[PDB]
Amino acid sequence: PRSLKKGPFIDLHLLKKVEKAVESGDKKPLRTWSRRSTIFPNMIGLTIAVHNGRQHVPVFVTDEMVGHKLGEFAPTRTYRGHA
Amino acid sequence: ARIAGINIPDHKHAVIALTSIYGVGKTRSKAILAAAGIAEDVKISELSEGQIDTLRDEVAKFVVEGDLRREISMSIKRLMDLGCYRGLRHRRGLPVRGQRTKTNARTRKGPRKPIK
Amino acid sequence: AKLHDYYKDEVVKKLMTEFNYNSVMQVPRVEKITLNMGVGEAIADKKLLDNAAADLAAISGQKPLITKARKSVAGFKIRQGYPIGCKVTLRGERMWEFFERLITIAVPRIRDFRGLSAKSFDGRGNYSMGVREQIIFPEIDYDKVDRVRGLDITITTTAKSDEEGRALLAAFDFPFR
Amino acid sequence: IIAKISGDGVYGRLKFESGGHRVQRVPATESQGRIHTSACTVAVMPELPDAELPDINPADLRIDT
Amino acid sequence: MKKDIHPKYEEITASCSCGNVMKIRSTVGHDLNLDVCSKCHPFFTGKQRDVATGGRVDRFNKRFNI
Amino acid sequence: STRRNLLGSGDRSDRNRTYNFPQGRVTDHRINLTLYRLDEVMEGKLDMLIEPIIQEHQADQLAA
RNA sequence: UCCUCCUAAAGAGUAACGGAGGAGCACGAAGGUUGGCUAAUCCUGGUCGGACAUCAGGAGGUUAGUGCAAUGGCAUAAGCC
RNA sequence: ACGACCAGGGCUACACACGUGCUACAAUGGCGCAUACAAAGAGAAGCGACCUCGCGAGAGCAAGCGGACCUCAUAAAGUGCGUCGUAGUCCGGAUUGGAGUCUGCAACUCGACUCCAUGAAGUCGGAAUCGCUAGUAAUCGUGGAUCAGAAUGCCACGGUG
RNA sequence: UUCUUCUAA
RNA sequence: GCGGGGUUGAGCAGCCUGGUAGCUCGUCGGGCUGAAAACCCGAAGAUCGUCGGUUCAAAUCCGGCCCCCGCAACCA
Ligand SMILES: [Mg+2]
Ligand SMILES: [Mg+2]
Ligand SMILES: [Mg+2]
Ligand SMILES: [Mg+2]
Ligand SMILES: [Mg+2]
Ligand SMILES: [Mg+2]
Ligand SMILES: [Mg+2]
Ligand SMILES: [Mg+2]
Ligand SMILES: [Mg+2]
Ligand SMILES: [Mg+2]
Ligand SMILES: [Mg+2]
Ligand SMILES: [Mg+2]
Ligand SMILES: [Mg+2]
Ligand SMILES: [Mg+2]
Ligand SMILES: [Mg+2]
Ligand SMILES: [Mg+2]
Ligand SMILES: [Mg+2]
Ligand SMILES: [Mg+2]
Ligand SMILES: [Mg+2]
Ligand SMILES: [Mg+2]
Ligand SMILES: [Mg+2]
Ligand SMILES: [Mg+2]
Ligand SMILES: [Zn+2]
């Protein structure tokens, strides 16, 4: 996990989409390749799409997701079973 | 003989017999006995009830046998209902911390399951 | 008989108040507390039954009626006549002295106790519960025993409804919710 | 090996796999390292239905006692 | 009751860590010194503690300050 | 007498495909199809590689 | 060879290589008597308990029971201790 | 475009089979305090004392050294004393939940380490099979190259023997 | 004392 | 018409007065071998022919059946 003296990590181009989402009032999917971004409490209720190498999957950001990073909710290896 | 819900053994030394509580190991057991004044190399037999009743309030500061199994299970089921990566690792049966699953992930996956 | 003395001076006035009973004989009184250890794995030998009987003769101060199977079922490999579980029916003077020891001592000595239930009154006020281990009672010495027993406590009372047994036990501070 | 492949349009996709199938590979059974020319022969045939019960009809008969 | 079949039933002393000497009747016989009882069990204090549902933002803003 | 025509024989002479594992190609002597992608074929997907046979089989029938 | 039902036509009987099943035992109590008791099954609640042991009510009213086939019996019980 | 740039992803998957390894199953030991003895290397965007803070990983500040000078660096097994008394244990450490630190735009997929908790299998391993003739096998620690960080591998070095 | 075999460039 | 049989993939035991499944081979995983045999080692498998029934319980007991194996189907 990241240091606490640095603060949590989010990307600027995600931050200039969340504040755009809070202002102009949209339920639009914000598709974002930043899997490494810690969810901020203003991101709660934002339908944001997180890349998983191939496609985007909508992560409806619940309150219970604030500590965790966006890539935990967009799994990249699609596994079903060997038989 | 009885601390915090369970029946601690009576022949072991005090920093060893307290370890039976789900919630202390050896470092927190040395911190339980750090404020009860008890020398850490006495047995649970030949103690005092004035010492054992003092000893339970030391254990009552920290989270133990019944109360610790519930915060752990709430934290694991927190990951289940999120459906995060850590939650999928718990509800499939595979190791969560990113270990090897190609060879010898046996502690989560149980014994060997041959091809039918 | 402390709680029966406690029944006749505070419980009767409380239940006549909140239910508006006509007659004082209409109040729910408890009738019997039945202590079963149905030990179905006592078909192995006598000693899993006759010792578990004596673990209940310590809890309730009575020798238990070692009961037998009513019919024969074959999923359990028992026949009609095998002794399969011992019970104790407690009435009067030794009912309340048990019911004093139950709600005071034996209930807070349960490992991971968070409270009893309130959906456990068998439709007609008779509160039927059950405990997981026989050593919640101080009667059972922890050292001298060997097997994790378990009994189920069944309180039978003359409540016609279901809430009237739910309110009778709350008069004796019974740990529900 | 004979495998029945049950799916939609199996014969429309695998009727063009009839005939031989030559290989030229340095094999596993060859110990001098040389390369051998082998073959197999695949014959994809469809699932024709069963003949079913030919029930003799007592008007197509001629019974001589 | 019957004259033989029942065990020795005696009024005893049941003290606790809240000092409550309480005289019950029982088959234990000896002077009983309990550990927790109905007076000192946290069914009325600590059961609102032990659920630990918690909030997530109030934990997250606690770690640092913007 | 309908799988005898489909097999034909088993020798190296009556083939339809080859699989040259040194230079890694799958020819197809019905048309030409000398394409140098065999590890896509032998391991798996010939899904767009039965398809060129069907076009010239359609060309046997739309040119009728 | 014996027992039970039907064919047997409302007393008894009544045939067929007619339709159905049983018996060639058991029991020193499974007999005698006195005292007492009331079944199957299902819903609900309940430690391990599971569709089903035991336990607690309730429904139910003999669908249970009889050492066994079938019929006629049986609560005063012929059933159960 | 089979060339090229980028972003995220993959090489880190998991019904399983094998190879090479480390840590074990303990009493010739585990833990606790004390105390003795090395060799060989590395280092300037680097090695970083001392000092204060933190349970600890580490943080603040700042000497010294291109080094037989200063730093990394305390060698450990050992010896003395105490305890454990043959139990899945004061053996074992997997695994998991919190709570952290550091490196790095960035530790979710996937880093190492720390702290508290949890304490699986394992009680010396079937058929079989491997290494080794003397400072050897055995067991103990140390160092380096690679590297921002990331070894139980590799290449070196000594200690008991 | 038993102890077989190695297809085709 | 009367006997006997149906038991893992296959060839078969055992069903004993009902409480419970055995073998040879085949199969799986390792071992040996340059590799495949042979051999060594670890293994797993059954809803006991079908559908009813009687018993608390049926592979076993009873009744009917579908195949299969025999035997007898004759005096005219
Ligand atoms: Mg512990
Ligand atoms: Mg008549
Ligand atoms: Mg007549
Ligand atoms: Mg009789
Ligand atoms: Mg009578
Ligand atoms: Mg009689
Ligand atoms: Mg890239
Ligand atoms: Mg790789
Ligand atoms: Mg292995
Ligand atoms: Mg020692
Ligand atoms: Mg240890
Ligand atoms: Mg370095
Ligand atoms: Mg310090
Ligand atoms: Mg030492
Ligand atoms: Mg041992
Ligand atoms: Mg630890
Ligand atoms: Mg074990
Ligand atoms: Mg030599
Ligand atoms: Mg490095
Ligand atoms: Mg041959
Ligand atoms: Mg072989
Ligand atoms: Mg059977
Ligand atoms: Zn108290």
mmCIF file of C-alpha atoms in Angstrom, chain C residues 7 15 21 28 78 81 96 101 125 127 132 145 162 172-173:
data_model
loop_
_atom_site.group_PDB
_atom_site.id
_atom_site.type_symbol
_atom_site.label_atom_id
_atom_site.label_comp_id
_atom_site.label_asym_id
_atom_site.label_seq_id
_atom_site.Cartn_x
_atom_site.Cartn_y
_atom_site.Cartn_z
ATOM 1 C CA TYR C 7 -43.422 -14.457 40.343
ATOM 2 C CA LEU C 15 -48.995 -9.001 33.329
ATOM 3 C CA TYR C 21 -56.974 -9.887 32.124
ATOM 4 C CA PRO C 28 -49.533 -17.215 32.139
ATOM 5 C CA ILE C 78 -32.296 -47.786 15.306
ATOM 6 C CA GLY C 81 -36.886 -50.218 21.898
ATOM 7 C CA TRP C 96 -37.844 -22.546 39.733
ATOM 8 C CA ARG C 101 -29.771 -21.000 37.968
ATOM 9 C CA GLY C 125 -46.071 -19.608 24.090
ATOM 10 C CA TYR C 127 -40.440 -21.273 24.705
ATOM 11 C CA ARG C 132 -24.598 -26.063 22.539
ATOM 12 C CA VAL C 145 -15.746 -34.853 31.388
ATOM 13 C CA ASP C 162 -47.495 -16.451 21.445
ATOM 14 C CA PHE C 172 -37.914 -12.445 34.594
ATOM 15 C CA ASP C 173 -35.256 -10.364 32.633
#
